[PDB]
């Protein structure tokens, strides 16, 4: 249950069979047998005994779910109460919208280690996404200072909603 | 080595009827301690 | 410059090992919890949202 | 946050009431635990700031410091047990109390919601500091140094007093929380262009800027070791903390009203770094090192990019710990040598093997060796500065080369070379001297493992 | 010349008290002023403090956000929604100036 | 009298050198780049008493730090523009400008690998103990500059300008250092100049965009 | 407990007083006790205060 | 302990002052050549030959061995530069 | 300022109207401060007169801690009234002259367009 | 001790403001400080224009 | 630039500006006639300050 395959897609594995063309022994095969017998079995034994001890006393932890409060867009002016609850709701999504971008930073990195010499091509499912996600993060969170606040994203957007309305009108 | 406590000379400046003595002001002399003059 | 270390390497190692015994034995026998779904109205307590047991001991008892 | 504070106040009763022989251990042992209570503030499980109560708050930027302010009082009281052990038993209990009040006041200043609470407590810290520097200062010139430390801060301070009373009338409350969630956008007038300077200048003065930093070299030179630690580790950073919380308002002007300072700081960084290269007094060199590495900070609290800010928060906490470490070891050489001259005392590793390891690690923290928070800090300010203008790397690039040179020169001409023939024989190292150091670096090693805690408000 | 003491010499505290720890001249105070400083200094601040600081859970929510992303990325991708839509405050909410 | 400390620093050097070798994100590459620099400073000047050893150690730090400015510049450019210090993503900057950054790494390599600019500290480094001269002055420390460019050569192939730049300076160092070696009368200093001349040939192959063979010479060298 | 065992209780006591004084502030700032939007819930059975 | 009389003073204007300073600095009165009076601060500090400690006889038992400077001899203004580490003014075969 | 108010008591300390206000809790931090302020006065006196600082005048120490505090309750009782009058006076005017203090309307942040100055 | 005093505490008592000292005492403090301002202003202005007109790529830059 | 130019300009100058200003304002004969006449001047100026701003 460590990682949700659907949030971290891993291409299926295709391995060429072990086709030997020499009577000479392949040292690694023998070494690996040992590693398992000496380094894996011993460890494997301990680990299980861990998880059984864990099972004897098992606990659960949940994931706080935050109800959605009203966003600055709708929030009286000067009402420090409402706006405080609404700058947090954003500063919170400033992070949830940031680990998403952390995953695309990561999912890609793997897709260029898993596909070397083909990264130019095979790994373009992601990089198309790394721009579909970067062109958005750039359009909602970038110009802002270190005092990022929902009022300023509200303005960074709305300075440009003129443009998607002045340019559009302009095209006429 | 001990913190430098002020010597006599550092003290001297604070005497005189005016700290920053002027051209003619310096000519003055400190007021009598008894608050009584000799004239 | 050697009396110092026998004292620094000692009083770190004094309270250090009982900790290391504590982190290891807890992490071994008690263990981190596994994530689950809030069961339709459990309204879990503050301690319930953290993984490591002693990291939710401090939360339940003090915060 | 009254456990980090009330128990602190009670230290004062303990320094006075306690036995003359046992006064030192009661005070040092108890404030070590006072630091342990301070660590509780670090338990932030959500991004919202912990508003303890109306007047007292702690957010990511203040919390990393309050803990440092509480941490150094133990250390300050351990570094001044030697000098100040020649006193009359009532001069000590005054020095110990003075040190205690500094962190009581500094803990509150860093943990204050109302900006003028910052001002009153901000400018109060001068009283305890001036007494520590002037009353116990060894050199003939501390009367002068004290004057410089009081006037440069004071002339800057009254403009801020007028500015903050001014914004209260303009907005209606100096509460940092509200001021943040309220619309205070200056209007780029000629007057506002003055307001901005009024608010930032007082903070820019105690954070030595290239133009007004002469107070810091003079002050740390004759200041006793405890005063020099306080000035470098917590006192100068009071200016940085102020610039972070005050520029929430005056949001529009700093976009164009900062150029003057930014250029003053980056050129200042080079010249301050360079004069370290040939300065005979070791305490002098560390002080200018402090000016340059703080000139980087005023150039990140002004570019105002998320990375700058936490580059700043990383460097301020890190450089604070490193500088003290350097000022603390400088004192250990000064007490045995009896002179501040760098040229004398050559070859110490030959005679003080470990202090030299502490010297080496302190210098590597001073220059940017990479698995250190010190480097992460500069790497980040460097990045943003580059974003502001790609050319900035040239000036922030001459500083890195110079910073390497003076940091190693302190090690090369103080802790290597042939031993000095026969200065007053140098008695071996006390365990206090070495711990006072270990207490500085062991936290530097631990913080570098998990930099997230000192990253600032931005991240 | 005026009257004043001659500069005092600094004692080699290591001549007597050859076990001097640097805190005080008489030996027992010294021992009890390091037995309490290494202890309260290192033994229960650098150790118990680092233990507590290490166990602060999901500091500043960055342990929570690497999951919320994962279910949002899980939910957004499977339902076909853009992973990070390009406007955050919905355009409908925003009444733009009509000029 | 201090054999154990000397062996201790040699392995610390190896740990930093290998970290420099196997570093995915460049922040770790920096940890290695700066890390070997500091321990070289500690080990060139093993015999601290001798001022000559101290002068060489300060020399080495200065030349390395000029190189560090280049790596910081490359790091900062890769911390902006394409955004991650991990090599696996930096390599997605193939079709970008990538000149501001690779010029920075070339500057870093010239300082670390004693190219014609700031070539003198590796001759000066011989003030160190002869074993120190062999493992770090001879192999691991100097090849670090060559290793960095091979790591970043997917980007290097795109920019023709920097490829000939290092082909050119590698070439000048090769002969410049070799001609100096002909008359040097110190045995250790002739070998050291040869260390620089061979790396000059290495630099030349990297300049002719032949990364794999350049690495092959590093191992045989 | 006053043979120098009373000077040792001064600071420990300050913590206690602080804690008490601190929890007092919580009592004062208890409006919006549970009236906040993100965290408004119906008092579960047998609970008269969401946060005390 | 060192009276101002034995510490640097102002530019020696009259010739008796130029011979008084030379005593303070333990020099020969005909070798004290005050740094030029252009008001940049040098004061009375002797203008000693700008030669680095590198070519000070490397065999003689210099009191301060590593600065190759004896005890009492006037120190050079820039000894932080012409020291055995930083700069080398020393004759070169070419 | 507040003098000239209707009903002003020409020389009285705290008019009975101040009875309506809550009495200051004896442990009000302020009165407790006055107490400490007082103890210190006492201790200081002992010091300036060269007496054992804490172990002397234990009667005086009490007079001090108990004089200052006594003064406090009856002062704070008043200053509290004065402030309370200020509101009675202030709030009343806001109403009697309503137009001058109109309740302006604040638009939601959606409507308002605040200029966005990029940091870049 | 005569050297350090001569070098950090006997300087300003022997300062006389001449030419070759104030001209050279202003070129050093304000010269580069004014040089870099027109180096950073021109760059920052070039950058801003390009961003305004829409040319600066700012690609994969999600940080600052 | 450090020491002299940055100490003569900001820290020292402000030292001198005042020092000189106190020297002129505080160098007083102590004679009553002089002082009093200054009271005369004041009355005159204040009379005017009211007059011109009538
Ligand atoms: C707090 C604000 C600032 C306050 C400053 C003064 C505070 C003094 C009093 C308190 C001191 C302790 C508390 C503050 C520091 C806390 C450090 C800490 O808690 O370390 C955490 C670490 C576990 O790591 P973790 O937190 O899980 O990291 C997150 C990974 N996602 O726990 C550990 O594993 C500890 C491991 C110890 C051994 C580390 C060995 C590696 C060292 C690498 C050094 C690299 C080179 C450093 C160079 C420095 C310059 C020369
Ligand atoms: C040295 C440290 C830095 C000093 C900076 C001083 C700046 C001026 C005083 C600081 C207070 C301030 O600047 O507040 C803003 C104020 C104008 O504010 P405002 O009420 O908006 O007026 C605009 C037109 N209605 O602007 C002013 O206060 C102007 C004050 C002018 C006189 C200031 C003192 C001059 C001394 C010579
Ligand atoms: C043909 C031209 C080709 C293009 C130019 C190539 C070279 C460009 C400049 C690179 C740096 C050159 C000088 C570097 C300093 C140096 O080499 O130090 C040597 C000095 C003495 O050492 P050395 O003489 O080698 O050994 C003693 C033998 N008896 O050892 C010392 O300790 C000297 C003092 C070192 C510390 C102060 C040096 C200045 C530090 C700040 C400035 C650094 C350089 C300027 C900033 C960086 C510029 C890129
Ligand atoms: C092209 C370059 C333009 C440079 C413009 C700024 C420098 C102007 C130089 C004016 C020189 C005036 C002069 O004659 O020399 C110094 C001047 C008079 O000198 P003197 O008559 O000897 O008396 C000095 C007091 N005893 O004495 C003085 O005037 C003292 C004040 C000097 C002010 C000018 C220099 C300011 C430097 C500021 C540095 C800030 C860092
Ligand atoms: C040490 C290594 C230095 C390496 C330098 C590398 C330079 C790369 C090329 C830079 C020039 C072309 C840049 C093209 C893209 C950027 C275009 C741009 O916006 O830059 C504008 C800037 C304008 O500068 P400037 O020529 O002064 O224009 C003033 C007009 N009144 O254009 C310029 O800034 C031109 C000057 C660039 C170099 C400035 C100096 C760099 C080195 C400074 C060392 C310290 C100098 C201190 C000087 C003190 C003087 C008293
Ligand atoms: C922007 C940054 C502005 C920084 C301003 C710094 C002002 C203070 C600088 C130092 C002033 C100073 O040291 O004054 C000393 C001077 C001589 O007197 P003193 O030193 O007490 O006695 C001689 C020695 N026994 O005493 C004096 O001449 C007067 C001292 C005035 C102190 C500053 C007053 C500022 C007033 C602003 C209005």
Burial of F120 (0-12, 13-18, 19+ CB in 10 A): middle
**Site of tokens 């500290």:** F121
Question: Which among E84, E90, E91 is the nearest to A100, CB-wise?
Answer: E84
- Domain ranges for chain I, please list them: 1-97
| Among D43, D27, D46, residue whose Cα is nearest residue D98 | D27
For residue C19, the tally of other CB atoms under 10 A from its CB is 13
Q: Which residues of J fall within a CB distance of 8 Å from D392?
A: 40
What number of helices (H) and strands (E) belong to chain J?
A: 3, 0
| Angle at A48 (CA atoms; ends A42, A54), nearest 5 degrees | 140
Q: For residue F109, how far is its CA from the centre of ligand 3 (angstroms)?
A: 18
| Angle, helix I29-48 to helix I58-96, in steps of 10 degrees | 140
CA pair distance C57, D15, nearest whole angstrom:
36
Cβ of J29 less than 6 Å from ligand 5: no
Q: Which of A137, A65, C59 is nearest to E64 (CA)?
A: A65
Give the three-state DSSP class for A168. helix
Return the beta strands (E) in chain C as ranges.
34-35
Distance D206 CA to ligand 5 centre (A): 32
Which chains border G (3 or more CB–CB pairs < 8 Å)?
A, D
Q: What is the spatial distance between Cα A88 and Cα D47, in angstroms, rounded to a whole number? A: 8
| CA D183–ligand 2 middle distance (angstroms) | 21
Separation of CA D188 and ligand 2 centre (Å): 14
Please note each residue after which chain I is broken, C-to-N distance over 2.5 A, or write none.
Answer: none
* Contact between residue D77 and residue D103 where contact means Cβ atoms under 8 Å apart: no
CB D227 within 8 A of CB D129: yes
The Cα B20–Cα A54 span in angstroms is 83
Partner-chain residue, chosen from E71, E82, E96, that has the shortest CB–CB distance to A165: E96
List Cβ neighbours of A94 (8 Å cut-off, separation of 6 or more).
A141, A148
Quick check: E1 contacting B, CB < 8 Å?
no
* HEC sequence for D218-276: HHHHHCCHHHHHHHHHHHHHHHHHHHHHHCCCCCCCHHHHCHHHHHHHHHHHHHHHHHH
Who contacts A61 (Cβ-Cβ below 8 Å, separation ≥6)? C33, C34, C35, C36, C48, C49, C50, C51, C56
C-alpha span between H74 and H71 (Å, rounded): 9
Residue F144 near residue F112, CB atoms below 8 Å: yes
Q: Are D269 and D392 within 8 A, CB to CB?
A: no
**How many angstroms separate the CA atoms of J11 and D90, rounded?**
39
* Three-class secondary structure of residue D300 per DSSP: coil
Residue from the list A57, A60, A62 with its beta carbon closest to the beta carbon of C30: A57
Q: What span, in angstroms and rounded, lies between the C-alpha atoms of I55 and I61? A: 10
Rounded Cα–Cα distance for residues H88 and H86 (Å) = 7
If DSSP codes are grouped into helix, strand and coil, which group holds residue D308? Answer: helix
For residues H13 and A40, give the distance between their C-alpha atoms in angstroms, rounded to a whole number: 90
Query: CB–CB of A120 and F94 under 8 A?
Result: yes
| CB neighbour list of residue D428: distance below 8 Å, 6 or more residues apart | C1, D352, E14
Dihedral angle sign, alpha carbons of residues E27, E29, E30, E32: positive
Q: How far is CA F216 from CA D89, D291, D377, F191, F204, in A?
A: 73, 48, 38, 20, 13
A165 — contact with chain I (CB < 8 Å)? no
- The helix (H) or strand (E) run that includes residue J4 is helix J2-8
Which resolution, in Å, applies to this structure?
Answer: 3.4
**Which helix (H) or strand (E) segment is F157 a member of?**
helix F153-158
- Chains H and D physically touch (3 or more Cβ atom pairs below 8 Å): yes
Dihedral of the CA atoms D6, D12, D15, D16 (nearest 10)?
-130
Domain ranges of chain K: 1-54
Tally of helices (H runs) and strands (E runs) in chain G: 1, 0
Asked if D415 and F73 count as a contact pair (C-beta separation under 8 A), the reply is no
Q: Measured between alpha carbons, how far is A150 from A85 in angstroms, rounded to an integer?
A: 11
Neighbours of chain I (3+ CB pairs under 8 A): A, D, E, J
CA B3 to chain D, closest CA, distance in angstroms equals 4
Phi-psi region of F8 (alpha: psi -120 to 50; beta: other; left: phi over 0): alpha
Return d(Cα I70, Cα I66) in angstroms, integer. Answer: 6
Cα Rg, chain H, nearest whole Å: 15
CA E50 to ligand 1 center in whole angstroms: 7
Residue-number span of the structural domain to which D195 is assigned? 2-459
Chain I residues 97-116 within an 8 A CB cutoff of chain D: 114-115
In angstroms, the CA D189 to CA G12 distance is 54
Residue D330's alpha-carbon distances to D130, D288, D327, I15, in angstroms, are: 21, 14, 5, 66
- Give the Cα separation of A83 and A154 in Å (integer): 13
CB-based contact J2:H27 (threshold 8 Å): no
CA D276 to chain centre: 18
Tell me whether residues A155 and I113 touch, CB distance under 8 A. Answer: yes
Residues listed for chain E:
99
Interface partners of chain F (CB pairs < 8 Å, 3 or more) are A, D, H, J
- The count of structural domains within chain D is 1
How was this one solved? cryo-EM
- Does A167 contact E at CB distance below 8 Å? no
Quick one: three-class SS letters along D12-62? Answer: HHHHHHCCCCCHHHHHHHHHHHHHHHHHHHHCCCCCCCECCCCCCCECCCC
Cβ(F46)–Cβ(F131) under 8 Å? no
Q: E strand or H helix at A61, and its extent?
A: strand A60-61
Helix (H, G, I), strand (E, B) or coil at F151: helix
**Could you give the CA distance from residue D427 to residue D351 in angstroms, rounded to a whole number?**
9
Residues H45/H48/H52/H54 CA torsion (nearest 10 deg):
-110
What length is written for chain D? Answer: 459
Tokens of D152: 């440069």
Q: For residues D195 and D186, is the Cβ–Cβ distance under 8 A?
A: yes
Whether the CB-CB separation of F178 and F193 falls below 8 Å is answered with yes
Helical pair D126-136 and D115-124, crossing angle rounded to 10 deg:
10
Q: Which tokens sit at D306?
A: 């998320």
Q: Is I71:I34 a contact under the CB 8 Å cutoff?
A: yes
Query: CA-to-CA distance for D97 and D23, rounded, in angstroms?
Result: 11
Residue partners of I70: CB distance under 8 A and separation at least 6: none
* Tally of CB atoms within 10 A around G2: 7
Q: Which residues on neighbouring strands pair with residue H46, listed in sequence order?
A: H34
Q: How many CB atoms lie within 10 A of CB D187?
A: 9
């Amino acid at each position: 249950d460590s990682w949700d395959k659907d949030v971290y897609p891993e291409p299926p594995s295709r391995t060429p069979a072990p086709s030997p063309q020499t009577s000479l022994p392949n040292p690694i095969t023998y070494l690996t047998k040992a590693y398992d017998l000496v380094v894996d079995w011993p460890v494997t034994l301990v680990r299980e005994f861990i998880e059984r001890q864990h099972a004897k006393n098992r606990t659960y932890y949940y994931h706080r779910q935050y109800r959605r409060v009203p966003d600055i867009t709708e929030c009286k002016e000067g009402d420090v109460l409402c706006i405080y609850e609404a700058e947090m709701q954003w500063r919170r999504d400033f992070k949830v919208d940031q680990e998403i971008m952390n995953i695309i930073q990561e999912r890609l990195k793997a897709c260029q280690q898993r596909e070397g010499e083909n990264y130019q091509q095979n790994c373009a499912k992601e990089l198309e996404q790394f721009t579909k996600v970067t062109k958005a993060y750039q359009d909602r969170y970038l110009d802002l200072g270190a005092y990022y606040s929902a009022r300023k994203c509200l303005a960074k957007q709305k300075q440009r909603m003129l443009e998607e309305r002045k340019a559009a009108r302009q095209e006429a | 080595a001990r913190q430098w406590q002020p010597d006599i000379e550092w003290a001297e400046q604070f005497s005189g009827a005016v700290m920053y003595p002027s051209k003619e002001t310096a000519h003055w002399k400190p007021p009598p301690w008894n608050d009584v003059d000799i004239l | 410059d050697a009396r110092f270390l026998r004292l620094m390497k000692f009083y770190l190692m004094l309270t250090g090992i009982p900790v290391i015994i504590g982190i290891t034995l807890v992490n071994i026998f008690i263990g981190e919890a596994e994530l689950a779904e809030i069961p339709e109205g459990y309204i879990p307590e503050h301690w319930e949202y953290y993984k490591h047991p002693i990291s939710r001991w401090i939360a339940r008892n003090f915060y | 946050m009254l456990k980090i504070i009330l128990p602190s106040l009670m230290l004062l009763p303990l320094t006075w009431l306690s036995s003359p022989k046992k006064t030192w251990t009661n005070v040092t042992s108890y404030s070590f635990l006072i630091s342990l209570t301070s660590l509780t503030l670090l338990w932030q499980t959500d991004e919202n700031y912990k508003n303890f109560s109306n007047m007292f708050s702690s957010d990511p930027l203040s919390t990393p410091l309050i803990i440092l302010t509480a941490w150094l009082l133990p250390l300050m009281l351990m570094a001044s047990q030697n000098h100040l052990k020649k006193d009359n038993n009532v001069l000590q209990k005054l020095y110990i109390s003075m040190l205690i009040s500094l962190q009581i006041l500094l803990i509150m200043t860093f943990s204050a919601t109302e900006l003028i609470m910052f001002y009153i407590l901000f400018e109060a810290t001068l009283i305890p500091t001036l007494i520590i520097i002037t009353r116990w200062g060894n050199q003939t010139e501390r009367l002068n140094a004290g004057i410089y430390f009081l006037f440069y801060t004071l002339i800057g301070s009254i403009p801020l007093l007028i500015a903050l009373i001014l914004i209260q009338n303009h907005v209606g409350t100096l509460n940092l929380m509200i001021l943040s969630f309220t619309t205070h956008t200056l209007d780029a007038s000629w007057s506002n262009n003055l307001l901005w300077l009024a608010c930032m200048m007082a903070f820019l003065i105690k954070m030595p800027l290239y133009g007004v930093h002469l107070w810091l070299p003079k002050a740390h030179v004759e200041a006793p070791i405890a005063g020099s630690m306080i000035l470098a580790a917590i006192l100068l950073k009071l200016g940085s903390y102020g610039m972070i919380r005050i520029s929430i308002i005056l949001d529009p002007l700093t976009k164009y009203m900062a150029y003057p300072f930014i250029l003053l700081s980056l050129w200042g960084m080079i010249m301050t770094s360079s004069i370290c290269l040939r300065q005979t007094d070791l305490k002098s060199l560390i002080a200018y090192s402090s000016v340059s590495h703080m000139a980087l900070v005023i150039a990140s609290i002004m570019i105002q990019t998320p990375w700058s800010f936490m580059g700043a928060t990383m460097l301020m906490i890190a450089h604070g710990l490193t500088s003290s470490l350097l000022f603390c070891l400088a004192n250990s050489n000064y007490e045995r040598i009896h002179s501040r001259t760098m040229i004398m005392a050559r070859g110490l590793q030959m005679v003080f093997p470990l202090m030299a390891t502490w010297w080496l690690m302190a210098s590597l923290a001073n220059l940017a060796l990479p698995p250190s928070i010190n480097l992460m800090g500069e790497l980040f300010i460097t990045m943003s500065l580059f974003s502001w203008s790609n050319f900035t790397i040239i000036l922030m690039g001459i500083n890195i080369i110079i910073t390497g040179m003076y940091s190693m020169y302190m090690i090369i001409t103080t802790q290597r070379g042939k031993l000095t023939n026969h200065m007053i024989n140098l008695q071996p190292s006390h365990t206090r001297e070495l711990t006072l150091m270990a207490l500085h670096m062991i936290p530097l090693i631990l913080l570098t493992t998990s930099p997230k805690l000192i990253t600032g408000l931005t991240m | 010349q005026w009257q004043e003491d001659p500069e005092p010499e600094d004692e080699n505290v290591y001549a007597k008290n050859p076990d001097f720890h640097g805190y005080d001249s008489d030996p027992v105070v010294d021992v009890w002023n390091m037995r309490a400083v290494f202890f309260f200094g290192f033994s229960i601040v650098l150790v118990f403090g680092t233990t507590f600081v290490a166990y602060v859970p999901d500091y500043r929510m960055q342990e929570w956000a690497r999951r919320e992303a994962e279910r949002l990325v899980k939910y957004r991708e499977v339902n076909g929604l853009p992973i990070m839509e390009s406007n955050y405050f919905d355009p409908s909410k925003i009444q733009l100036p009509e000029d | 009298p201090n054999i154990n400390r000397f062996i201790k620093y040699l392995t610390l050097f190896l740990i930093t050198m290998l970290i420099l070798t196997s570093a995915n994100n460049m922040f770790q590459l920096f940890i290695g780049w700066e890390g070997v620099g500091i321990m070289s400073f500690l080990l060139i000047g093993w015999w601290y008493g001798r001022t000559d050893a101290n002068t060489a150690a300060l020399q080495a730090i200065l030349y390395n730090r000029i190189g560090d400015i280049g790596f910081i510049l490359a790091m900062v450019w890769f911390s902006l523009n394409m955004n991650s210090w991990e090599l696996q993503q930096i390599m997605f900057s193939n079709n970008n400008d990538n000149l501001i950054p690779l010029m920075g790494l070339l500057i870093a390599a010239t300082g670390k690998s004693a190219q014609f600019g700031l070539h003198p500290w590796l001759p000066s480094a011989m003030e160190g103990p002869t074993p120190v001269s062999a493992l770090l002055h001879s192999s691991t420390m100097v090849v670090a500059g060559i290793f960095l460019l091979v790591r970043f050569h997917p980007l290097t192939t795109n920019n023709n300008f920097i490829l000939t730049t290092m082909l050119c300076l590698g070439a000048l160092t090769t002969l410049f250092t070799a001609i100096c070696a002909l008359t040097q009368n110190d045995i250790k200093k002739i070998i050291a100049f040869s260390t620089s001349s061979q790396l000059g040939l290495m630099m030349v192959t990297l300049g002719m965009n032949q990364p794999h063979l350049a690495f092959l010479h590093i191992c045989t060298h | 407990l006053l043979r120098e065992h009373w000077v040792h209780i001064l600071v420990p006591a300050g913590f206690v007083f602080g804690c008490y004084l601190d929890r007092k502030d919580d009592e004062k700032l208890t409006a919006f006790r549970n009236k906040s939007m993100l965290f408004q819930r119906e008092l579960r059975p047998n609970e008269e205060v969401t946060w005390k | 302990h060192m009276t101002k009389d034995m510490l640097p003073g102002s530019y020696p204007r009259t010739p008796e002052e130029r011979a008084a300073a030379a005593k303070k600095y333990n020099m020969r009165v005909e070798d004290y050549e005050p740094y030029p009076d252009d008001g940049m601060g040098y004061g009375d500090y002797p203008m000693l030959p700008n030669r680095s400690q590198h070519e000070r006889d490397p065999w003689y038992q210099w009191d301060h061995s590593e600065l190759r400077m004896n005890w009492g001899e006037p120190i050079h203004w820039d000894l932080d530069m012409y020291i055995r580490n930083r700069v080398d003014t020393s004759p070169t075969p070419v | 300022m507040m003098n000239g108010r209707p009903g002003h008591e020409p020389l009285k300390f705290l008019p009975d109207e101040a009875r309506s206000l809550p009495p200051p809790k004896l442990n009000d931090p302020r009165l407790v401060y006055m107490g400490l302020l007082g103890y210190c006065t006492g201790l200081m006196d002992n010091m300036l007169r060269m007496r054992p600082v804490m172990r002397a005048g234990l009667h005086r120490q009490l007079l001090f801690v108990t004089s200052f505090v006594f003064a406090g309750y009856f002062y704070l009782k008043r200053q509290n009234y004065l402030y309370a009058v200020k509101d009675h006076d202030m709030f009343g005017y806001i109403k009697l002259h309503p137009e001058d203090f109109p309740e302006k309307e604040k638009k939601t942040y959606a409507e308002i367009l605040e200029p966005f100055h990029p940091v870049r | 001790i005569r050297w350090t005093y001569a070098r950090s505490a006997n300087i300003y008592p022997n300062f006389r403001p001449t030419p070759k000292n104030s001209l050279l005492g202003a070129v050093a403090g304000f010269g580069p400080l004014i040089f870099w301002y027109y180096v950073f202003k021109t760059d920052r202005d070039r950058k801003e224009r390009l961003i305004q007109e829409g040319k600066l790529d700012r690609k994969f830059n999600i940080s600052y | 630039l450090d020491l002299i130019w940055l100490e003569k300009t900001i820290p020292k100058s402000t030292s001198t500006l005042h020092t000189n200003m106190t020297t002129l304002t505080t160098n007083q004969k102590g004679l009553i006639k002089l002082y009093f006449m200054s009271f005369l001047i004041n009355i005159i100026l204040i009379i005017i300050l009211y007059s011109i701003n009538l």
